[PDB]
Design a protein around this ligand. Structure first.
Ligand code: CHL
Ligand code: CHL
Ligand code: CHL
Ligand code: CHL
Ligand code: CHL
Ligand code: CHL
Ligand code: CHL
Ligand code: CHL
Ligand SMILES: CCCCCCCCCCCCCCCC(=O)OC[C@H](COP(=O)(O)OC[C@@H](O)CO)OC(=O)CCCCCCCCCCCCCCC
Ligand SMILES: CC1=C(C/C=C(\C)CCC[C@H](C)CCC[C@H](C)CCCC(C)C)C(=O)c2ccccc2C1=O
Ligand code: SF4
Ligand code: SF4
Ligand code: SF4
Lengths: 80, 143, 741, 60, 74, 163, 74, 72
């Protein structure tokens, strides 16, 4: 499965969660940013690795990072 | 809030069938079920190709991948303003409820969620790969 | 309900304000650049009218006025072609001697030594030899002087200015409304009866009254200056009746239905004129008259304003069966609301028409002295083949664009489009199997032959003197078409073409046309053609069918028609877009059409073209197609290595420009591989280092330099690949056939 | 730290490292990266603003 | 002729060296990918974001330079 | 380098004779006073003038009868070959510095405007013509900026990637 | 003689490509910036833009002028 | 082919092929152990480079040896 990490530069804009096609990400309460929320990745076993979340992230550098790892049926996006 | 249970007697949308549906993986590995309650009978686009008619009231569709179910749910939420529930079904009959996991959509912040994968540093503070040699870790992001 | 003229008065102000604002048409691009990507995006999105606005009326008005602009540009190009024939050509000298004088209508200026390209083409003239066939077309029209070419050039520029006026007028002053454009029944009636039908009738009139008597006098041996002008044949009926005696009866046989009296100038001879090697002009006049009547009848099918006629929607909705669900229901709404679906259909049929035109123009040459001008024959065949292939790839592209942008599942439930989408996996898998089978049983025959020949076993080869693969169906068709004047078309004097069989048509000691026999090599190359066409179809059809979704990416329609990928996940999703399927189909169409034009060039040089002497026919390459075209080594040696000697020794002659273009096109093709084999991340990092160097000397631009986008990198790679390969074949073909023809 | 004051970015992974931007606002609720900086150039994502901590910006 | 082909050889050597050296020195990171050391020597890309990141790894620089080396030795 | 002057090279004279012979062979198929005859005669005259000018320029010819250029500034100066590479080097370097300085001055002038990116694709033509004419005196201004330290941006003001 | 020259030159080209590839692998995997603080390795990493840009310049000059001279002669 | 055409075309093609095998009688009796997928992006670059280099070397070796041997 791929590894998705969230770094503390996240501004809680929820764009990565909205961009995710497999529901890997969600917003949890936080206090390190003005929006009082941070992204989290509790379901990385469903991560395909499309990096739509990184395309959606506005911070510089990225607050959400996807590291491609070992490939399973879910991560390879196989319907067969 | 409690996780809903899957009702397998829920009617399916009016569909003539297609070659893009389930395969052997559904019988032996897993498949996915999306359920939604339609306000009215209307035509929607199948994620596997073609047009189907959703029935008024509850609907049940079996799909091969979670991404197909979430694409259909995105279409239902954006075009028909309809919420939905996604389940994972195993060949032994076990049903795992997936989305929305706590009843609130993941883009909306909800209390009771715990951050996983959070790092208390910016991405430029990751160590060097020579520091994780012969440690068994995945990489500098894993430490 | 009622077909009528509806326009809007003065919708768009004629001003230069938006000329000073690049990107004004786009909401995103109007804000100006931040990076260099904006420069490319402005040119890439300039003609995507449906991306600028969602209003179908504005799109239709833009399309109409752009079509007027294209017609004006085409008329400028044609008027320039007629002008260069009038002013910078040897057309009159060529008219006096069409066998020993090479056509030329381009003269270069003497500077930097380039006047060597003004070759000794004959007629006391120096210039670049042309292969477009304009001289033979002008001779067939009856043009005998440079003044008549001057008149056509001036009249073309006047009509070109009228087309540019009409484009300005129908966009800025009187722009038709959407309901005007959606009168497809009236458009079809007018374009069948009025455009094609009246065009064919008017050209039959020109042929009868001008082309027939002038070319009759030309083939009789009369000097072109002594031939009377066309209006002399118009005004003096006795001068017309001297050549065609039925003109003494006037129009009375036409109106008394004594049509057989006109048999002297309305003929059904068939075959070729032995003097000129072209089709009989009387045959062409009768052809165009019959075509005119057929199209005038065809243009009265659709109901507009007087009750009678067909409704296309009713015809489409009535044609449904048990296997096909709702049938053609909803196709009328697609084809009256989507410009891209119409463009897909029209591009497919126009490209197929161009390829059919190439085959019919080589086989039945319709211009005098066209067939013995081997450079012109090869050039027009190759050109129209390439135009056809490009248009077919464009048809695939715009079918995919329709599927992404204009497809609506609500209006397509259980119709033909929905049912085709619903079994796309079966279609693609069966086509994939057909392509694999065709590739094996066509290319593996060549590999088997190359291995057998290299193993010293020519008796185990696939050849005429070995294991034979005779194309018996095509041979039977040839025999049937040779025997057509006997029974199945008794009023035709000759077969349609000499390629079916019979005698050799020779003009000036050179073969105009002759039978084209088919053997094992023809069988093998025809199945190679079938294989390559099937693979190109597979790529383009897979792009159309999976443009909206697949098992890999279920929401591909939300990503658009043209996007690079969906990231390295799911194993990697590079080139999933329908645009990338067009991008690969361009390569495969190039491969297919390259083999088609190579087959044409080698087969006509080996078995058709040549010199007719007293003993017989000596071909250009001496019949080596049937001996060696069944191996890859035979192709590489006897076609590629042997026939490229003319382009590589063209230096120091008038053909040296072809050698330079040969080298430069090899360069451009090689240059394309850096775009195709690489990716933009490397180039962006290299640009970062270069930008650092520019920042050090305070010469960093405000418009930030970026590497090309992934899609632009693919587009640049395929464009330079096509340009390099096609221009390589172009220079090789033209140098070879001008030097040896 | 002030309003519309030129600052130099010291974050090494930032696109605008060693570059000068304008301070838009400074958050006072104790968040991790309170300084909002506007830059005259866009990064590779087309963004012109980023948030920095107090130690990541130097007034120039 | 020896002059011209020797300068062609110099172009080949310098370009192959440029690709390889840029790949080695940007292996740890660039402005497009400042954390490239976290992803290793060989990886496909970083996705279509930030303009597109095809062939951004140092392995890809080796792969590009093999073409130029083959051209140079040719 | 063992070469001979082209004015006394037998290969040079043979090449001139062969080129004139080929052009004269092409010339004999046209009547006198016609346009092809005049064009071929002009080409013949240009060929003769070119061979005479190359012989008179002191060019050295190889065994192939073709002129060979000398690019070492020592051998060019002491043997009269400076017009082959050295003087063209000076001329090119002057024009290239002119173009580069004009571009740099235009970029620096456009940097100070309210819309610096606007002047990069919509050219300030009067300003570009004024700056372009001022590029004749580029070496003086460039060498002064080099001595003053204003030609180079400081390393602290230039972005770099993490190392 | 031709076979031996061509063989050993292609072998040398592949080996040089591998040398630079494993230099890049060292920089990704084994390079410790703190252990190499201020030495020649860190200093050549610290002006990599100058190195890459000057290599780009010399490659561009050689390619432009060698190709231009060849095309002029052609 | 491996250097110009990239992955996602081939993965969708292989998806249709995997559909075809499971739906074909007398052939769905046999089945794969490893799910057929297209070659990865890096693997494709490597395989295309290997075919390119092998063709380069084999072509030039054949030409060099034949052209030097046939005259000497
Ligand atoms: C498809 C359209 C087309 C093409 C490709 C050409 C191509 C050419 N024309 Mg023909 N023309 C064309 C359409 C037309 N032309 C002409 C009338 C002429 C003339 C009278 C001449 C050409 C000449 C030329 C050649 C040199 C042009 C040049 O150097 O521009 C120069 C570039 C400029 C920027 C100057 C433009 C000045 C002009 C007043 C505006 C070139 C082969 C010349 C010739 O063929 O060689 C002897 C020449 O004398 N063209 C008319 C009628 C107005 C056309 C319609
Ligand atoms: C001098 C006459 C004239 C002026 C001032 C305008 C002014 C305008 N036009 Mg009208 N037009 C004019 C004549 C014509 N118009 C049109 C048809 C249209 C259309 C269909 C549209 C306009 C639009 C526009 C607007 C801005 C787009 C533009 O002009 O970009 C300038 C673009 C160019 C100069 C490109 C050059 C194209 C040219 C045909 C060359 C073709 C290529 C060459 C052969 C070279 C190829 C290599 C602006 C209000 C657009 C609009 O209103 O808003 C979006 C619009 O959609 N015009 C035609 C028929 C082709 C004309 C002749
Ligand atoms: C009747 C013909 C026809 C028409 C009206 C259109 C119309 C359109 N096309 Mg289709 N196309 C057509 C035929 C063909 N199409 C295609 C394949 C495509 C693709 C793949 C795409 C379109 C797109 C578009 C749209 C925008 C085009 C644009 O902005 O151009 C901009 C033009 C340029 C930037 C210049 C192009 C130059 C060209 C690539 C090279 C030219 C080389 C020269 C001929 C020779 C050498 C020149 C010298 C100087 C070196 C527009 C709806 C695009 C769109 O997004 O869809 C809505 C799109 O992605 N077309 C092919 C196969 C190549 C065709 C033949
Ligand atoms: C010469 C170069 C070349 C070859 C051999 C191929 C091969 C193929 N292409 Mg590629 N391509 C090639 C150039 C390129 N292609 C592409 C892009 C594509 C696309 C987009 C597609 C293909 C498809 C195909 C297949 C067509 C079906 C077929 O004919 O199977 C028969 C196989 C052959 C004819 C190859 C030769 C085999 C030989 C005759 C038999 C050899 C057997 C051995 C002797 C036995 C083994 C013994 C050994 C192991 C000891 C086939 C695998 C299509 C496909 O995959 O679907 C059907 C397809 O859609 N190619 C690009 C970039 C644009 C190229 C450059
Ligand atoms: C790439 C640099 C370069 C190389 C390899 C050469 C090579 C040569 N120079 Mg040249 N030069 C070069 C750049 C320059 N030179 C000169 C100015 C000269 C002069 C004035 C002379 C040479 C001479 C020579 C020759 C003997 C030099 C020597 O060391 O004798 C130990 C040798 C062929 C000598 C000669 O012309 O030939 C023997 C000589 O007198 N060079 C200038 C201007 C400052 C250059 C820049
Ligand atoms: C203002 C113009 C300008 C100046 C002063 C420079 C200066 C430099 N360039 Mg940059 N460049 C410039 C424009 C452009 N350059 C480039 C692309 C590159 C690359 C890829 C590289 C350089 C490199 C270099 C350096 C070495 C000299 C060289 O290689 O020239 C070569 C220059 C070119 C190949 C492009 C030159 C095009 C044109 C002749 C210049 C532009 C003229 C302006 C449009 C004039 C406008 C002025 C008017 C408005 C008054 C040097 C710092 C090299 C390096 O970084 O060295 C360390 C290097 O590898 N330049 C493009 C895109 C094609 C430009 C436009
Ligand atoms: C003594 C020299 C030497 C040693 C000990 C190593 C050792 C290593 N290398 Mg280095 N290499 C060496 C020289 C070279 N290297 C490289 C370029 C690389 C790269 C780019 C990489 C390595 C990697 C590796 C590691 C993993 C090797 C592996 O998994 O193989 C697997 C081997 C294969 C998959 C072989 C398949 C490819 C081969 C070319 C097939 C050849 C078949 C022919 C085409 C067939 C032709 C005949 C046909 C027609 C019948 C290992 C540390 C990797 C690394 O360190 O990890 C990140 C890595 O990415 N090497 C080249 C340039 C070609 C060299 C010469
Ligand atoms: C014949 C094929 C070919 C050509 C000409 C090039 C060209 C280039 N490569 Mg590319 N490559 C080529 C094949 C391949 N390369 C690569 C991979 C790379 C890499 C990885 C790199 C290069 C770089 C370079 C540059 C080398 C420096 C130089 O020579 O400057 C001279 C420039 C040229 C010779 C380009 C042509 C100039 C042109 C003739 C000027 C004239 C233009 C016309 C007047 C414009 C006319 C336009 C029309 C429309 C009127 C140069 C731009 C390097 C570079 O970017 O940094 C310097 C670099 O890092 N190449 C691959 C594998 C993917 C190939 C296959
Ligand atoms: C020479 C060309 C290659 C010929 C062989 C290629 C066969 C490839 C396609 C597979 C056959 C699939 C038929 C499914 C399509 C299907 O729905 O079949 C039913 C089709 C139409 O039946 P209906 O009566 O439903 O049609 C009402 C129509 O008006 C509406 O489409 O009739 C056929 O049998 C078509 C003929 C198939 C033969 C095609 C030959 C073309 C000439
Ligand atoms: C070489 C290459 C580049 C680099 C090429 C670039 C950046 C294009 C450069 C085009 C021109 C030459 C840049 C400058 C354009 C200016 C308008 C020209 C001004 C100069 C005056 C003389 C007119 C990519 O960006 C790329 C991206 C994706 C896949 C492959 C590749 C690829 O192969
Ligand atoms: S890589 Fe794709 S699937 Fe994975 S978390 Fe990001 S958006 Fe979701
Ligand atoms: S897109 Fe980036 S900044 Fe926004 S919530 Fe996700 S990780 Fe945080
Ligand atoms: S290599 Fe390029 S095209 Fe392929 S997935 Fe990565 S970013 Fe997309």
């Amino acid at each position: 499965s791929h590894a998705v990490k969230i770094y503390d530069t996240c501004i809680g804009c929820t764009q990565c969660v909205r961009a995710c096609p497999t529901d890997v990400l969600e917003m949890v309460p936080w206090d390190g940013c003005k929006a009082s929320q941070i992204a989290s990745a509790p379901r990385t076993e469903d991560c395909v690795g499309c990096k739509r979340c990184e395309s959606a992230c506005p911070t510089d550098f990225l607050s959400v990072r996807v590291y491609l790892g070992s490939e399973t049926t879910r991560s390879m996006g196989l319907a067969y | 809030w409690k996780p809903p249970t899957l009702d397998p007697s829920t009617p399916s949308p009016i569909f003539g069938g297609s070659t893009g549906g389930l395969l052997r993986k559904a019988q032996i590995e897993e498949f996915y079920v999306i359920t939604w309650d339609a306000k009215k009978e209307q035509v929607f686009e199948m994620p596997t190709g073609g047009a189907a008619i959703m029935r008024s009231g509850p609907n049940l569709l079996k799909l091969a991948r979670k991404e197909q179910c979430l694409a259909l749910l995105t279409q239902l939420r954006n075009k028909f303003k309809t919420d939905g529930q996604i389940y994972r079904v195993f060949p032994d009959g076990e049903v795992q409820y997936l989305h929305p996991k706590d009843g609130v959509y993941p883009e909306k912040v909800n209390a009771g969620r715990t951050a996983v994968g959070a790092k208390d540093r910016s991405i430029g503070k990751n160590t060097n790969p020579v520091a994780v040699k012969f440690t068994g870790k995945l990489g500098t992001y894993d430490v | 309900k009622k077909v009528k003229i509806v326009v809007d008065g003065n919708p768009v102000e004629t001003s230069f304000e938006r000329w000073a604002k690049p990107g004004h048409f786009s909401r995103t691009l109007s804000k100006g650049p931040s990076t260099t990507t904006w420069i490319w995006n402005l040119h890439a999105d300039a003609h995507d009218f449906d991306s600028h606005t969602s209003d179908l009326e504005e799109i239709s008005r833009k399309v109409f006025s752009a079509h007027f602009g294209q017609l004006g540009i085409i008329l400028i190009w044609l008027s320039g072609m007629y002008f260069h024939g009038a002013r910078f050509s040897n057309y009159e000298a060529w008219l006096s001697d069409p066998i020993h004088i090479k056509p030329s209508a381009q003269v270069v200026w003497p500077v930097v030594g380039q006047e060597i390209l003004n070759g000794d083409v004959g007629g006391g003239f120096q210039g670049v030899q042309i292969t477009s066939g304009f001289f033979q077309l002008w001779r067939a029209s009856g043009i005998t002087s440079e003044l008549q070419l001057y008149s056509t050039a001036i009249g073309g520029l006047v009509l070109a200015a009228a087309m540019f006026f009409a484009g300005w007028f129908h966009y800025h002053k009187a722009a038709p409304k959407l309901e005007w454009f959606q009168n497809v029944e009236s458009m079809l009636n007018h374009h069948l009866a009025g455009l094609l039908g009246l065009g064919s009738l008017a050209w039959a009139g020109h042929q009868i009254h001008v082309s027939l008597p002038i070319n009759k006098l030309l083939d009789a041996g009369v000097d072109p200056k002594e031939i009377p002008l066309p209006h002399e044949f118009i005004l003096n009926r006795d001068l017309m009746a001297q050549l065609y005696p039925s003109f003494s009866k006037g129009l009375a046989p036409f109106f008394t239905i004594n049509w057989s009296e006109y048999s002297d100038f309305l003929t059904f001879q068939g075959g070729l004129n032995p003097v000129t090697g072209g089709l009989w002009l009387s045959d062409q006049a009768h052809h165009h008259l019959a075509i005119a009547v057929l199209f005038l009848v065809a243009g009265h099918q659709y109901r507009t304003n007087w009750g009678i006629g067909h409704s296309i929607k009713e015809i489409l909705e009535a044609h449904k069966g048990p296997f096909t669900g709702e049938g053609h229901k909803g196709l009328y709404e697609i084809l009256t609301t989507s410009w891209h679906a119409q463009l897909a259909i029209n591009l497919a049929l126009f490209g197929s028409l161009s390829i059919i035109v190439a085959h019919h123009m080589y086989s039945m040459p319709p211009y005098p002295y066209l067939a013995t001008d081997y450079g012109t024959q090869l050039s027009i065949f190759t050109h129209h083949t390439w135009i056809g292939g490009f248009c077919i790839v464009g048809a695939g592209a715009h079918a995919a664009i329709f599927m992404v942008r204009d497809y609506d599942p609500t209006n397509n439930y259980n119709n033909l489009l929905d049912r085709v989408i619903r079994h796309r996996d079966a279609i693609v898998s069966h086509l994939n199997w057909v392509c694999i089978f065709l590739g094996f049983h066509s290319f593996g025959l060549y590999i088997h032959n190359d291995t057998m020949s290299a193993l010293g076993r020519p008796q185990d080869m696939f050849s005429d003197t070995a294991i034979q693969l005779q194309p018996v169906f095509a041979q039977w068709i040839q025999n049937t078409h040779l025997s057509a004047p006997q029974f199945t078309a008794p009023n035709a004097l000759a077969p349609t073409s000499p390629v079916w069989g019979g005698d050799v048509v020779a003009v000036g000691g050179k073969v105009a046309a002759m039978p084209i026999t088919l053997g094992t090599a023809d069988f093998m190359v025809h199945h190679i053609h079938a294989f390559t066409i099937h693979v190109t179809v597979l790529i383009l059809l897979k792009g159309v069918l999976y443009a909206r979704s697949s098992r890999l990416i279920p929401d591909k329609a939300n990503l658009g028609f043209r996007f690079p990928c969906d990231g390295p996940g799911r194993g990697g999703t590079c080139q999933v877009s329908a645009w990338d399927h067009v991008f690969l189909g361009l390569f495969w169409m190039y491969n297919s059409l390259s083999i088609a034009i190579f087959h044409f060039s080698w087969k006509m040089q080996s078995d058709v073209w040549g010199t007719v002497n007293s003993t017989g026919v000596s071909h250009i390459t001496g019949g080596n197609f049937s001996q060696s075209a069944n191996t890859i080594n035979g192709w590489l040696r006897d076609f590629l290595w042997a026939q490229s000697s003319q382009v590589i020794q063209s230096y120091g002659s008038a053909l040296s420009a072809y050698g330079l273009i040969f080298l430069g096109a090899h360069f451009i093709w090689a240059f394309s591989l850096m775009f195709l084999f690489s990716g933009r991340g490397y180039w962006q990092e290299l640009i970062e280092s270069i930008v650092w160097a520019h920042n050090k000397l305070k010469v960093a631009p405000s418009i930030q330099p970026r590497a090309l986008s992934i899609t632009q990198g693919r587009a640049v790679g395929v464009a330079h690949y096509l340009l390099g390969g096609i221009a390589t074949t172009w220079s090789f073909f033209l140098a070879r056939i001008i030097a040896v023809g | 730290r002030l309003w519309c004051v030129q600052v130099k970015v010291l974050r090494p992974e930032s696109y605008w490292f060693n570059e000068v931007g304008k301070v838009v606002s400074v958050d006072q609720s104790g968040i991790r990266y309170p300084v909002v900086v506007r830059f005259p150039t866009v990064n590779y994502a087309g963004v012109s603003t980023n948030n920095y901590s107090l130690e990541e910006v130097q007034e120039v | 002729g020896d002059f011209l082909v020797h300068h062609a050889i110099a172009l080949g050597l310098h370009t192959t060296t440029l690709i390889l050296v840029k790949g080695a020195l940007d292996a740890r990171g660039s402005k497009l990918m400042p954390d490239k050391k976290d992803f290793g020597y060989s990886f496909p890309c970083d996705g279509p974001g930030r303009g597109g990141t095809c062939d951004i790894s140092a392995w890809d620089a080796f792969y590009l330079a093999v073409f130029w080396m083959l051209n140079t030795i040719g | 380098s063992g070469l001979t002057p082209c004015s006394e090279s037998k290969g040079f004279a043979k090449r001139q004779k062969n080129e004139i012979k080929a052009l004269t062979k092409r010339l004999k198929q046209y009547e006198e006073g016609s346009a092809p005859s005049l064009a071929l005669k002009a080409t013949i005259e240009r060929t003769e003038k070119r061979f005479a000018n190359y012989g008179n320029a002191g060019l050295l010819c190889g065994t192939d009868g073709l002129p060979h250029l000398i690019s070492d500034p020592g051998l060019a100066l002491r043997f009269g070959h400076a017009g082959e590479t050295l003087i063209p080097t000076v001329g090119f370097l002057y024009i290239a510095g002119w173009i580069g300085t004009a571009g740099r001055d235009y970029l620096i002038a456009s940097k100070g405007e309210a819309k610096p990116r606007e002047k990069e694709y919509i050219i300030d033509v009067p300003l570009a013509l004024k700056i372009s004419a001022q590029g004749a005196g580029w070496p003086f201004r460039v060498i002064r900026e080099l001595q003053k330290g204003t030609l180079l941006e400081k390393d602290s003001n230039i972005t770099v990637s993490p190392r | 003689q031709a076979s031996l020259y061509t063989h050993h030159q292609y072998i040398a080209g592949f080996i040089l490509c591998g040398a630079f590839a494993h230099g890049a692998i060292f920089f990704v995997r084994d390079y410790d910036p703190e252990q190499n603080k201020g030495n020649v390795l860190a200093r050549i990493l610290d002006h990599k833009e100058a190195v890459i840009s000057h290599l780009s310049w010399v490659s561009l000059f050689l390619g432009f002028h060698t190709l231009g001279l060849y095309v002029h002669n052609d | 082919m491996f250097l110009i055409s990239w992955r996602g075309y081939w993965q969708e093609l292989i998806e249709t092929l995997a559909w075809a095998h499971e739906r074909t009688p007398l052939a769905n009796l046999v089945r794969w152990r490893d799910k057929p997928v297209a070659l990865s992006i890096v693997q494709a670059r490597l395989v295309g480079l290997a075919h390119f280099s092998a063709g380069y070397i084999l072509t030039y070796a054949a030409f060099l040896i034949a052209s030097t041997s046939g005259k000497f």
